[PDB]
């Protein structure tokens, strides 16, 4: 793996996601959006097993675009979360288990708060200020512990994010070929395409 | 534990002519180090001018031949006695073999006959049904002792025109069914000497627009 | 068609039930299809759980296979999950559901019986229920079903107060049954059961003080005759 | 086996439904009796139903029957995006809906649907308006414009003599201008009776409210009386 | 006036005392009562025409699909419940590709036809031996026309009953009894595609008792070379114009 | 189904105008449910049944007018949908979604015409934080409808009229408790209304905070609010 | 095995080797490593010999079936997601395939999807796959402009395959070339690697450490 990051601030949630796709010996693509939009104000980044990864995220995309369309209501993050969880917990005692880890981040239009949820391929779900899957956590959690305030402006938090990626490029053996940073707030899901040099 | 598989060796070779095709196999059928029969044929007439050979594990090849010979009986009844295009039997065999994809017929399998244009054709198969059309392919144990030689004396590989330095490749000729038969029965007399799984008898089926003919030649019995 | 089954219930031997303050009582008569038959080999008042009994009016067989299907459903759907036995209200529910399905299912006729199910659960106390072929079910202070239905139901309004001791309700349900009786009237042609105090006498074992034995007691041929003399 | 025609009757009796193609836009319209005084206004204004981000659908018929369609469709709409990654094309969503009312006759022997439906929207990318109509039989047809429902015949007559292919209502605004007039004929009070939705190229579906509907009726019956 | 009635009318999949299965004898009269459809075979192609019958300027014809492709070499025309034949076609398209996969060749028109009949041959609600899973005879007739290299160009009539004949030229639908007796008069073993393109129109003009255009007629053909194309409205018109003239001959 | 008619439905839709009589009134800060009880015998046990007023979840409840054994088959499966939408999304089920879920099973028979339609008509009273307090209706037609005040069963056409008359949008909850009882003045075949012919329910703005208490009235609590006028 | 495909101004180039081996033994060099699916789409055999031929042949069917049913050409995006989905259905039953699905449509432009046994589906511009994949990538990466003359970019495929056939023992034989335009694909011959090597050493001045 395969870098999946995310930090929830005051007014939004931010998700980092390595750009690289590696097939054993060669790096096949240097530009992979490792995230599906689940709805206007809810984003899901993901990493894990080869094919299992995308096929899951798209199944969830479908099922949430369907509940959106049906009740003409934007399903709240807490709920999209607790649904994605159940769908993983279901597949863990199944025949071939989805082997996928995800970060769900979105804006609860009703509490006007940002929320970040972390769910592993087992169905283990917990809500966090910041989170990560794979080994991404070891190099970066020590920095977040230290520099994180929950009142951080969206700008203050992008800064702290670049600092983590920098540490991962320094002490991590994998060449993950950068990140794509996406932001989720009241206005929805936008992507900062000026990052590896901000 | 129970192993549902075997080897019976033997060795087959299929060659596509211009107005003909030959499909040859040895007559020896073995298990390990003993001999089972000196005469138990490997190459079969299937009707509609199609000869085939499913070589490797006898029970699996015998069973695949049966199953195709039957696919013909029914393409008859089902499509008013129509002739099975060589190219169409190949594809039906792909579907036959891949049917048992996850428990394959352990056979390298070759068919020969005439394409819809009258020219000679030969097709080779995986045990899982990859098929390509071939000029000449050998399958079986002694496959490796035949092909190099054929590449050289049939497709004139690595052969140049004398005294042209090495710039003019020896010009590809086309060969009488009588010449191909020469090369076949020398490919085999050769292999028989250096492969212990080859010997006993050599049977060739020959397809022309006139039908299917059997020639048979003896092989060293050691 | 449910209506025609309620009709088989309207004829067929009378049976009744009376709830009291400290117990419930249910009874019917044992009409002997012959004097050659030994009427002790057939029970119109059957135990479902040691806290719950039942009586019927109508088609004999349909009652048997309903008492059986009913006992089983008490384990399969409650005891094997929660370790307790079911409460009267809910076991009754699970029987109505059973009969209501013979209704709304194709290829089968509803049952020719109305049931009176009597019992005691720790939280709801005593209670007495009626279940009809329709699958509907109603809670009763007291009622009767069958031929003598109308005579007896009228006598129960006249004689019932909400201060009856169980012994008072036994007394009533004997008079009530004496006016309707078709054959003879003794302990051999009356079946009476009660849902009263816990009977430790009848547990079969002694050593755990937390389970105290059956509330359901079926009065013996003798106990009945004894009450009919001082009657 | 005739029960088909009977259902097609229930169509007739139901909430009246219309639709109208444009130079580059599409519109529906339909509904029933304002409010029986005491009914909740704000919780079933579900006249036209959204199928995908770019495809809508109205119906004339048993309201309780539509829902079973407006779902089986809202679903195949996703189950197409999912197994082919490509929004459903308006003809296909339509052929799937109609193909279902069809299979509700010829097998098992079960009852057919009490709905005709109109289905509108733009295919993905392509900006050429599409409008279709289904009926309990299994028939789908494309229309430059159409109506089905109650007193639907009065409207189909109106429209025929008011739409021409040579010049289709190009303006967004004016394309609605027309769809209104055509329901005022059959309603039973006016603006308070039937409402509308509007879809423009590339998943831009914006349904109209009460206040935009009366900057229309009361800008129609102005030009009207002027003789 | 007067009333003739047998006691075995009605009867569903049970024999009359004659051996007649009236449920299906009637299935066959309702072909005579749908859209007109006509097929003619030359040695240079096969032509299929139908009656569109547009019922408005709004309804943009062409959602009237009464002629459809099956593979590039096989087309069919239909008279009757066009909606009831959705499944009949799906099975034919599916069978023709399925054959192409399993065998690397286009599927014989004779056998593509028989396969469609073998489908409507699963009519019933109670069968022991082999199961026939469906509900009613298939309520639509087909003209199936195409080309394989064994038996030249071909025309076929597939009936709901599951059987078929190979007509050298056939008409089904509202006009059939009459159109048919007209083809029986004007067809020869030596027609040219040009000649039959037109004879199909002449016979649609007749048994429609009307003057025809591209809003009420659709023409299609199937050649060895170009495959199975359906004439767009322009071509169908200067084919029509070309008759307005040819018949003003005498 | 001759003229565009749902026969087997009208059959049971008018079988409804026989049994029971139920009412729902939506106030601005609460909701109210109420029903009359079937032809009662002296000896029927009043307090137990809760025979025509059933709880669905801590935030939703229904009044019934129809065959009891028939609604229990429905309610059992609706109390479950509630809990499946919990275990699944960890939020309480939204009222409209539950209503539709049933209405869709009702219409399930209104079409797979191989089994028999549903007795029963429902008034649903529920709260969810998306659409304030809600009032819904469910005939076996399959249709549901929004209501500020509604009624089903015998003497239906009559009460709908008194309701239309005394209702005001600014209404409180206690004001609507009366309007419900008051207008079972008329729509009562039993001359004089007792606490035992009744069953009642409320969904208020909580007995304390900004939240939602639910309350199926115990017999005594009825004879207490009946005290406000009805009988004394 | 070596297979490669890439996008450019003039569409898509596909190039493959043709060697197929059973260990040290070379069993055929007459392998069609490019699969003519239908005349508007190509797939590249790489991984499992049969597994590729078969499901892509099958794809060709499900593709016709789709054009008849919608009277319109199927989009590379959906052609590929059909194969990706059918193959993910058999995950770890032991399927082996690694293939580039290639097409040029009105709506999408030149479009390449990489699809493998694992269930992966990836849109890209440049994909090489097989034993000699790394060698091809080397040549492609250094000499790849987007606006390449259709004739220069066809030569690039011819040669990124050469680099690989040379080094890799398991690639070699002959090179098959394909060009994909909006109007369909066009074969560009089968050039035997034997003779082609020498032709390139002279004209390019390259392969300088190969005494000849």
- Domains of chain G, by residue range, sit at 1-212
Contact G70 D125 (CB under 8 A): no
Are 3 or more Cβ–Cβ pairs between G and B shorter than 8 Å?
yes
| Eight-class DSSP state of A180 | -
Phi, psi of G123 (to 5 degrees): -85, 135
Query: Taking a contact as any Cβ pair under 8 Å apart, which residues of chain D between 166 and 185 contact chain G?
Result: none
Alpha-carbon distance E122 to E111, whole Å? 17
Phi, psi of B35 (to 5 degrees): -105, 135
Which positions in chain G touch A54 (Cβ < 8 Å)? 119-121
Tell me if E222 sits within 8 A of E44, measured CB to CB. Answer: no
Domain count along chain A:
1
Contact G122 A51 (CB under 8 A): no
- β-bridge partners, G20: G28
| Cis amide leading into A2 (omega within 30) | yes
Strand order from edge to edge, sheet including C137-139: C46-49, C52-58, C113-121, C125-131, C137-139
Alpha-carbon distance F184 to D162, whole Å? 54
| Eight-class DSSP state of C19 | E
Host H or E run for residue A62? helix A52-71
Host H or E run for residue D3? helix D3-13
Alpha-carbon distance A157 to A146, whole Å? 13
Mutation test of the interface with chain A: which of F84, F85, F86, F88, choosing the one with the most A Cβ atoms within 10 A? F88
Secondary structure string (H, E, C) spanning C48-79: EECCEEEEEEECHHHHHHHHHHHHHHHHHHHH
CATH of G1-212, picked from 3.30.160.150, 3.60.20.10, 3.90.480.20, 1.10.8.60, is 3.60.20.10
Q: Provide the b/e sequence for E99-109 (b: ≥16 CB within 10 Å).
A: bbbbbbbbbbb
C166: left (phi over 0), alpha (psi -120 to 50) or beta: alpha
Alpha-carbon distance D136 to G130, whole Å? 55
> Quick check: D83 contacting G, CB < 8 Å?
yes
Nearest CA-CA partner of C23 in C150, C152, C172:
C172
State both tokens at C63.
Answer: 């009652």
Question: Would the CA dihedral through A45, A50, A52, A58 be positive or negative?
Answer: positive
Tell me if A38 sits within 8 A of A179, measured CB to CB. Answer: no
DSSP letter string over chain E? ------SSSS-SS---TTS--HHHHHHTTSSTTS--EEEEE-SS-EEEEEE-----SSS-TTS---EEEEETTEEEEEEE-GGGGHHHHHHHHHHHHHHHHHHSSPPPHHHHHHHHHTTTT---S--SSS---SSS---EEEEEEEE-SSS-EEEEEE-TTS-EE--SEEEESTTHHHHHHHHHHH--TT--HHHHHHHHHHHHHHTTTS---TTTEEEEEEETTTEEEEPPHHHHHHHHHHHHHHTS--
Alpha-carbon distance D113 to D72, whole Å? 13
Which residues of G20-68 form beta strands (DSSP E)?
Answer: 20-22, 25-28, 34-38, 41-44
Cβ partners under 8 Å of residue D145, min gap 6? D18, D19, D20, D21, D131, D159, D163, E58
Shortest CA gap B128–chain G (Å): 6
**Helix C88-104 to helix F68-89 angle, to the nearest 10 degrees?**
110
Phi, psi of C12 (to 5 degrees): 90, 150
Contact G91 A96 (CB under 8 A): yes
Strand order from edge to edge, sheet including G41-44: G34-38, G41-44, G98-105, G109-116, G121-124
Contact E59 D159 (CB under 8 A): no
Contact A82 F88 (CB under 8 A): yes
Which positions in chain D touch F133 (Cβ < 8 Å)? none
Nearest CA-CA partner of B23 in B74, B65, B63:
B65
3-state secondary structure of G13: strand
Tell me if C118 sits within 8 A of C130, measured CB to CB. Answer: no
CATH of E9-250, picked from 3.40.50.620, 1.10.1740.10, 3.40.50.300, 3.60.20.10, is 3.60.20.10
Phi, psi of F141 (to 5 degrees): -60, -40
Tell me if F193 sits within 8 A of F180, measured CB to CB. Answer: no
Domain count along chain B:
1
Tell me the pairing of strands A26-29 and A35-39: unpaired
Alpha-carbon distance D92 to D99, whole Å? 10
Contact D85 G85 (CB under 8 A): no
Residue D217, number of CB atoms within 10 A of its CB: 15
Which positions in chain D touch G85 (Cβ < 8 Å)? 83
Alpha-carbon distance A139 to A156, whole Å? 20
Question: Would the CA dihedral through D98, D102, D103, D108 be positive or negative?
Answer: positive
Cβ partners under 8 Å of residue A108, min gap 6? A41, A76, A77, A78, A114, A115
Which positions in chain D touch F145 (Cβ < 8 Å)? 39-40, 44
Tell me if A134 sits within 8 A of A1, measured CB to CB. Answer: yes
**Domain enclosing residue A73, as ranges:** 1-195
| Eight-class DSSP state of F226 | G
Secondary structure string (H, E, C) spanning A72-105: CCCCCHHHHHHHHHHHHHHHHCCCCCCCEEEEEE
DSSP letter string over A137-179? HHHHHHHHHHH--TT--HHHHHHHHHHHHHHHHHH-SS----B
Query: How was this entry determined?
Result: X-ray
Nearest CA-CA partner of C5 in C116, C107, C99, C137:
C99
Shortest CA gap A53–chain D (Å): 15
- The verdict on whether G30 is a catalytic residue reads no
Compute the residue count for chain A: 198
State both tokens at A18.
Answer: 């390595």
User: Could you give the count of Cα atoms lying within 13 Å of G96 in the half-sphere of its Cβ?
Assistant: 12
Which residues of G29-75 form beta strands (DSSP E)?
Answer: 34-38, 41-44
Q: Hey, where are the domains in chain E? A: 9-250
| Eight-class DSSP state of F77 | H
CATH number of the structural domain spanning residue A82: 3.60.20.10
Widest distance between CA atoms in chain D: 61
| Eight-class DSSP state of D92 | H
3-state secondary structure of C13: coil
Tell me if G15 sits within 8 A of G157, measured CB to CB. Answer: yes
Nearest CA in chain D to G72: D89
**Quick one: how many helices (H) and strands (E) in chain B?**
4, 12
Widest distance between CA atoms in chain G: 59
Residue B71, number of CB atoms within 10 A of its CB: 19
Residue B151, number of CB atoms within 10 A of its CB: 15
Tell me the pairing of strands G25-28 and G34-38: unpaired
Alpha-carbon distance C99 to C106, whole Å? 13
Nearest CA-CA partner of D38 in C23, F149, C14:
F149
Alpha-carbon distance G161 to G131, whole Å? 11
CA angle C213, C214, C217 (to 5 degrees): 140
| Eight-class DSSP state of A41 | T
Q: Resolution for this model in angstroms, one decimal place?
A: 3.0
Nearest CA-CA partner of B36 in B3, B1, B16, B7:
B7
Long-range contacts of D76-84 (CB under 8 A, 24+ apart): D77/A69, D77/D51, D77/D52, D78/A62, D78/A63, D78/A65, D78/A66, D78/A69, D78/D52, D79/A62, D81/A62, D81/A65, D81/D52, D82/A58, D82/A59, D82/A62, D83/G81, D83/G82, D83/G85, D84/G78, D84/G81, D84/G82
Phi, psi of G135 (to 5 degrees): -75, -45
Nearest CA-CA partner of A87 in A46, A142, A143:
A46
Secondary structure string (H, E, C) spanning A116-142: EEEECCCCCEEECCEEEECCHHHHHHH
Tell me if G56 sits within 8 A of G41, measured CB to CB. Answer: no
Tell me if B139 sits within 8 A of B10, measured CB to CB. Answer: no
CA distances from D164 to D21, D121, D153, D161 (A): 11, 20, 18, 8
Tell me if D7 sits within 8 A of D111, measured CB to CB. Answer: yes
CA distances from C192 to B201, C17, C195, C230 (A): 98, 10, 11, 17
Tell me the pairing of strands A181-185 and A188-192: antiparallel
Alpha-carbon distance G107 to G130, whole Å? 30
Tell me if D40 sits within 8 A of F148, measured CB to CB. Answer: yes
Residue G65, number of CB atoms within 10 A of its CB: 18
Alpha-carbon distance B15 to B21, whole Å? 6
Q: Is G136 annotated as a binding residue?
A: no
Alpha-carbon distance G148 to G160, whole Å? 15
């Amino acid at each position: 793996m395969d870098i999946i990051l995310g930090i929830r601030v005051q007014d939004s949630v931010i998700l980092a996601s390595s750009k690289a796709v590696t097939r054993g010996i060669s790096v096949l693509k240097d530009s992979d959006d490792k995230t599906r939009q689940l709805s206007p104000h809810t984003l899901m980044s993901f990493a894990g097993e080869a094919g299992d990864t995308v096929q899951f995220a798209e199944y969830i995309q479908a099922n949430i675009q369907l509940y959106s369309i049906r009740e003409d209501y934007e399903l709240s993050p807490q709920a999209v979360s607790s649904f994605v969880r159940q769908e993983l917990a279901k597949s863990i005692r199944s025949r071939r288990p989805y082997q996928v880890n995800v970060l769900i981040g979105g804006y609860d239009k009703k509490k006007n708060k940002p929320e970040l949820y972390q769910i592993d391929y087992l169905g283990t779900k917990v809500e966090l200020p910041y989170g990560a899957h794979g080994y991404s956590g070891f190099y970066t959690f020590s920095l977040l512990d230290h520099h994180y305030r929950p009142d951080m402006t969206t700008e203050e938090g992008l800064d702290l994010l670049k600092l983590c990626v920098q540490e991962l490029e320094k002490r991590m053996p994998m060449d993950f070929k950068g990140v794509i940073v996406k932001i989720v707030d009241k206005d929805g899901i936008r992507q900062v395409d000026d990052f590896q040099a901000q | 534990q129970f192993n549902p598989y075997g080897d019976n060796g033997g060795t087959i070779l299929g060659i596509a002519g211009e107005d003909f095709a030959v499909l040859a196999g040895d007559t020896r059928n073995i298990t390990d180090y003993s001999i089972n029969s000196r005469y138990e044929p490997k190459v079969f007439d299937c009707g509609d001018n199609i000869v085939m050979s499913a070589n490797g594990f006898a029970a699996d090849g015998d069973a695949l031949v049966k199953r195709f010979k039957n696919s013909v009986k029914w393409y008859h009844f089902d499509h008013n006695d129509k002739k099975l295009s060589i190219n169409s039997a190949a594809r039906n065999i792909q579907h036959l073999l891949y049917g048992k994809r996850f428990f394959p017929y352990y056979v390298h399998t070759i068919i020969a006959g005439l394409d819809e244009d009258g020219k000679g054709a030969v097709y080779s198969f995986d045990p899982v049904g990859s098929y390509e059309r071939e000029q000449c392919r050998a399958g079986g144990a002694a496959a490796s002792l035949i092909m190099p030689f054929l590449d050289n004396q049939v497709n004139f590989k690595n052969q140049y025109e004398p005294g042209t330095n090495g710039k003019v490749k020896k010009p590809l000729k086309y060969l009488s069914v009588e010449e191909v038969i020469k090369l076949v029965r020398d490919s085999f007399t050769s292999a028989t000497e250096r492969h212990i799984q080859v010997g006993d008898g050599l049977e060739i089926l020959i397809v022309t627009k006139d039908g299917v003919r059997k020639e048979f030649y003896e092989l060293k019995r050691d | 068609q449910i209506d025609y089954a309620l009709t088989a219930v309207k004829q067929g031997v009378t049976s009744l039930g009376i709830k009291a303050t400290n117990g419930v009582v249910i009874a019917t008569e044992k009409k002997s299809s012959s004097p050659l038959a030994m009427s002790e080999t057939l029970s119109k008042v059957s135990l479902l759980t040691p806290d719950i009994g039942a009586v019927y009016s109508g088609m004999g067989p349909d009652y048997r296979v309903l008492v059986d299907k009913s006992r089983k459903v008490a384990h399969t759907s409650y005891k094997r999950i929660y370790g307790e036995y079911p409460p009267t209200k809910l076991l009754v529910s699970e029987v109505a559901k059973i009969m209501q399905e013979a209704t709304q299912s194709g290829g089968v006729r509803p049952f020719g019986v109305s049931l009176l199910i009597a019992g005691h659960d720790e939280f709801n106390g005593f209670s007495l229920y009626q279940v009809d072929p329709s699958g509907s079910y109603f809670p009763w202070k007291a009622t009767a079903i069958g031929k003598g239905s109308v005579a007896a139901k009228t006598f129960l309004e006249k004689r019932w107060n909400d201060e009856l001791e169980l012994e008072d309700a036994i007394h009533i349900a004997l008079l009530t049954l004496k006016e309707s009786v078709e054959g003879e009237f003794n302990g051999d042609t009356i079946e009476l059961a009660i849902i009263g105090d816990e009977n430790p006498d009848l547990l079969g074992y002694t050593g755990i003080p937390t389970d105290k034995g059956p509330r359901f007691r079926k009065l013996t041929s003798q106990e009945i005759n004894d009450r009919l003399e001082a009657l | 086996i005739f029960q088909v025609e009977y259902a097609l009757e229930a169509v007739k009796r139901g909430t009246c439904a219309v639709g109208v193609k444009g130079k580059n836009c599409v519109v529906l319209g339909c509904e029933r009796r304002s409010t029986l005084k005491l009914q909740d206004t704000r919780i079933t204004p579900s006249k036209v139903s959204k199928i995908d981000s770019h495809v809508v659908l109205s119906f004339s018929g048993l309201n309780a029957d539509s829902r079973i369609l407006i779902e089986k469709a809202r679903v195949e709409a996703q189950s197409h995006r999912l197994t082919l990654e490509d929004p459903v094309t308006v003809e296909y969503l339509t052929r799937y809906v109609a193909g279902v009312q069809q299979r509700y006759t010829q097998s098992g022997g079960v009852r057919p649907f009490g709905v005709s439906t109109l289905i509108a929207g733009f295919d993905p990318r392509d900006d050429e308006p599409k409008l279709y109509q289904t009926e309990p039989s299994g028939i789908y047809s494309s229309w430059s414009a159409q109506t089905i429902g109650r007193n639907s015949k009065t409207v189909r007559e109106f429209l025929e003599k008011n739409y021409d292919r040579k010049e289709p209502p190009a303006t967004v605004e004016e394309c609605v201008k027309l769809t209104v007039r055509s329901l005022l004929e059959v309603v039973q009070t006016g603006a308070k009776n039937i409402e509308i939705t509007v879809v423009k190229p590339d998943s831009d579906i914006v349904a109209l409210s009460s206040e935009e509907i009366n900057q229309y009726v009361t800008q129609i019956e102005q030009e009207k009386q002027e003789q | 006036m007067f009333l003739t009635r047998s006691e075995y009318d009605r009867g569903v999949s049970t024999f009359s005392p004659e051996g007649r299965l009236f449920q299906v004898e009637y299935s066959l009269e309702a072909i005579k009562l749908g859209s007109t459809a006509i097929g003619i075979a030359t040695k240079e192609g096969v032509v299929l025409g139908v009656e569109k019958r547009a019922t408005s300027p709004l309804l943009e014809s062409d959602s009237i699909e009464k002629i459809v492709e099956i593979d590039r070499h096989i087309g069919c025309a239909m008279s009757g419940l066009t909606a009831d034949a959705r499944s009949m076609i799906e099975h034919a398209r599916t069978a023709a590709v399925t054959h192409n996969l399993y065998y690397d060749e286009d599927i014989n028109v004779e056998s593509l036809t028989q396969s469609v009949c073998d489908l409507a041959l699963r009519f019933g609600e109670g069968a022991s031996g082999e199961e026939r899973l469906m509900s009613r005879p298939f309520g639509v007739a087909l003209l199936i026309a195409g080309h394989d290299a064994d038996d030249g160009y071909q025309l076929f009539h597939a009936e709901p009953s599951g059987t078929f004949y190979r007509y050298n030229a056939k008409a089904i639908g509202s006009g059939s009894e009459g159109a048919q007796a007209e083809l029986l008069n004007e067809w020869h073993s030596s027609l040219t595609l040009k000649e039959a393109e037109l004879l199909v129109l002449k016979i649609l003009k007749q048994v429609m008792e009307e003057k025809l255009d591209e809003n009420n007629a659709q023409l299609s053909c199937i050649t060895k070379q170009d495959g199975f194309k359906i004439y767009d409205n322009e071509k169908t018109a200067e084919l029509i114009k070309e008759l307005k003239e040819k018949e003003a001959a005498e | 189904s001759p003229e565009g008619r749902l026969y087997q439905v009208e059959y049971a839709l008018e079988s409804i105008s026989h049994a029971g009589t139920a009412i729902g009134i939506m106030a601005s800060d609460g909701i109210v449910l109420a029903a009359e009880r079937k032809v009662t015998s002296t000896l029927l046990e009043q307090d137990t049944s809760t025979e025509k007023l059933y709880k669905l979840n801590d935030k939703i409840a229904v009044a019934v007018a129809g065959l009891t054994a028939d609604a229990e088959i429905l309610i059992n499966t609706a109390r479950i949908h509630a809990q499946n939408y919990l275990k699944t999304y960890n939020e309480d089920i939204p009222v409209e979604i539950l209503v539709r879920r049933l209405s869709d099973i009702k219409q399930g028979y209104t079409q797979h015409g191989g089994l028999r339609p549903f007795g029963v008509s429902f008034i649903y009273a529920g709260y969810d934080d998306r659409y304030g307090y809600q009032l819904y209706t469910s005939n076996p037609s399959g249709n549901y409808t929004g209501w500020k005040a509604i009624s089903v069963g015998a003497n239906t056409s009559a009460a709908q009229t008194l309701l239309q008359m005394d209702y005001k949008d600014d209404m409180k909850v206690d004001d609507a408790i009366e309007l419900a009882l008051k207008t079972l003045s008329k729509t009562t075949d039993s001359s004089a209304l007792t606490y035992d012919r009744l069953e009642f329910a409320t969904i208020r703005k909580g007995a304390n905070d900004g939240e939602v208490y639910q309350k199926i009235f115990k017999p005594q609590e009825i004879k207490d609010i009946l005290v406000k006028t009805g009988i004394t | 095995t070596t297979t490669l495909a890439f996008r450019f101004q003039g569409g898509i180039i596909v190039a493959v080797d043709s060697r197929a081996t059973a260990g040290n033994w070379v069993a055929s060099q007459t392998v069609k490593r490019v699969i003519e699916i239908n005349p508007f789409l190509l797939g590249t055999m790489a991984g499992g010999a049969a597994d590729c031929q078969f499901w892509e042949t099958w794809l060709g069917s499900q593709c016709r079936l789709h054009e008849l049913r919608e009277k319109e050409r199927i989009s590379v995006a959906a052609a590929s997601k059909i194969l990706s989905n059918l193959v993910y259905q058999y995950k770890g039953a032991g399927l082996s395939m690694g293939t580039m699905i290639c097409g040029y449509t009105r709506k999408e432009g030149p479009t390449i999807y990489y699809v493998d046994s694992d269930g992966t589906r990836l849109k890209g511009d440049i994909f090489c796959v097989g034993s000699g994949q790394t060698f091809a990538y080397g040549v492609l990466d250094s000499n790849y402009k987007w606006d390449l003359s259709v004739e220069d970019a066809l030569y690039l495929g011819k040669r990124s395959i050469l680099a690989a056939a040379h080094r890799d023992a398991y690639s070699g034989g002959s090179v098959n070339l394909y060009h994909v335009t909006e109007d369909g694909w066009i074969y560009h011959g089968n050039h035997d690697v034997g003779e082609l090597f020498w032709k390139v050493k002279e004209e390019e001045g390259s392969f300088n450490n190969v005494i000849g």
